Amino acid sequence: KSEEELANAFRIFDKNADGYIDIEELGEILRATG
Amino acid sequence: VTEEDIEDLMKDSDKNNDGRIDFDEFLKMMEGVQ
Description:
Chain A is mainly α. Chain A has helices at 4-13, 23-29; one strand spanning 21-22.
């Protein structure tokens, strides 16, 4: 009952994966497709 | 409709001005509405 599907969700968003989100990535979540 | 609107939403939903986000911030940026 922990962090597992919000985990796969937070990694599925992340580009190269040191572990964090930045203001430059966040627009590309609300846009990128292809 | 451009990245200044995206810039005001990360600055609206943030408070302490950690202009980079960790997985904490993720849990409340999703559902930290009361």
